Symmetry: D2
């Protein structure tokens, strides 16, 4: 069984960048529904798989991608944020960011452009291409997880679903993006990067 | 040139079902951006078309569908709502609703299920199938317009993008749906129905 | 497991409408490949689910739908064809066709148009809509199965992948469709129909 | 307007690798159909845009992309092949291939794998990523053009629609791909490469 992970900090720790109300709703309401529905969907799939029912397996695909992706995406997101984050990364990561994007500022612009640009609900990702051996920016629609649909290893994800910023920033997505850079836990994205730095 | 249509009522007229803040942001901010970007996108397309630049035409497709759909969808939506709406439709429409869905209650359930069920951003629609000659329920992702992507004539649309209900109903989409039935302008959906009742 | 079903007639039984070469290749090579890969994908999916690896489950989705759908679709297709086929259906199926499509001829035109109209690889389908109690024509891309992705119950399917007709009819898909009507197994289509009008 | 380009060699010039029958059908029938329908779709799109009919513009999108892409793709494809082709590229293109893919052999494997791997109809592409300054392999479904849907600049394209190889290689796509390497026009691919490294 999958579980709702605990937040590494209090709901009001990312203030004033992302307010406590969004953090509470996002985690306790949105993420909780994903794991519950994921466990419900996985049990159904186990029933379908055992019967060799291919129709049921295919019909169940959207719910699993949506809920399974929802769980995966949000789980990474909480670890990517920190009340002690912000600033710039250091060491190997910064080294690779300058190499692949030109500069840290250029990387920020690319990821922001990618995030602001998703039409509808989605995610902006900084990922690692294990085949090519470099960093890569990608945008994923709805809850489609990065690794599962793209093959890239997720390092940093930015949720651009409206529930992630509307209460505080309303329709101005760029304001939310400008603000989230102040709480990015570079300590965690450097770890994820090192984990696949092979 | 396309224009931002005026609302048929004051921003606070649909209260307490849909509050004035959502109505103001939704119309003055969201819809306004769609027409502006649509006009910008259409001019670009006219440049591409004149040059016979097929690459530019294809690259421009998402922006036109998103912004063009955005304009179309929201324009219909404002006419579908009214401070004097609610209740049940009468005459021909009600007659066709019972015929195609069993009862008005059954129709409500079907459209609600369709609307609550869109994964991500989208719309729930009551449309008319001119080929088959009956009413049909459909769900469209993001801003993909009903007629243009499906062929069905739009009668009643329900916006399930989070910006349409989050400030007031938060994550509980069903609450928003339960509430919107009280402001549905059946007078307008009966007109749209009669317009294609051929 | 899943196994390649034996054809209920020999490869040359549908001549001159569909030649023996196509039938042999379609069954022994194309369909066979789908079951082999379906078995492998299912085994991998079982592995992933036991370990709760949501990323692996999502990564396997395209393969499962394509190979599972390939098996499902072709398995129905073989039963939809017959050396004893052709003509028109009798009884209830025919009544339902007259009611839903105007006549059998109008139905022939519509299914033909939907098949000839698929861009790329795909299938043309006459399906049953359990929810509305009526017949419906739908087109599915590549190997996406009708029931698993649409909810409709498959009755008659027309494979419009180029491999189903190219050797004999080259690029002329309409010639292939005109010839397929002579081998449609209406006894089977009726059989499938009676099964869902329950 | 758009016109069917004359082949820069006769239909039997690529034998025994790609037979004359395929070349004749591919150019005179398949490609010709795309330009005819592209011209009609463009004319209809001009009508729609002049009238500001956003619904008609969106309804024409699938046709424009499929037929426009069909013209673009096949037009590049013909120039990518040559009776004088084969072997390996020289100079900068080869250097870029060694740098980005390890070697020419590894590059051959990757493009072959991406082509053989497309489910249904599509294309395998070696493209140029202007933003990152490197070579990249991509696969496009049906007739979706590389630049218009991906932003990458096309250098070499491999048509994996069954009509490009079925008559000669039947279902064995790997045989077709092994043979196509003998007629690749590296002078043209280099030409396209030099054009974007500007
Ligand atoms: Mn979220
Ligand atoms: Mn809206
Ligand atoms: Mn087939
Ligand atoms: Mn082709």
């Amino acid at each position: 069984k999958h579980s709702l992970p605990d937040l590494p900090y209090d709901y009001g720790a990312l203030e004033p960048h992302i307010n406590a109300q969004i953090m509470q709703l996002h985690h306790s309401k949105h993420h909780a529904a994903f794991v519950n529905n994921l466990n419900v969907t996985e049990e159904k799939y186990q029933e379908a798989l055992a019967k060799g029912d291919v129709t049921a397996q295919i019909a169940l695909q959207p719910a699993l991608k949506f809920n399974g992706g929802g769980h995966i995406n949000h789980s990474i997101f909480w670890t990517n944020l920190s009340p002690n984050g912000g600033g710039e990364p250091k060491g190997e990561l910064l080294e690779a960011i300058k190499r692949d994007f030109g500069s840290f500022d250029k990387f920020k612009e690319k990821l922001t452009a990618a995030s602001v640009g998703v039409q509808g609900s989605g995610w902006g990702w900084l990922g690692f291409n294990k085949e090519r051996g470099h960093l890569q920016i990608a945008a994923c629609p709805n809850q489609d997880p990065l690794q599962g649909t793209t093959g890239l290893i997720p390092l940093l994800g930015i949720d651009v679903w409206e529930h992630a910023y509307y209460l505080q920033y309303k329709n101005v997505r760029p304001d939310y993006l400008k603000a989230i850079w102040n709480v990015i836990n570079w300590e965690n994205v450097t770890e994820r990067y090192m984990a696949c730095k092979k």
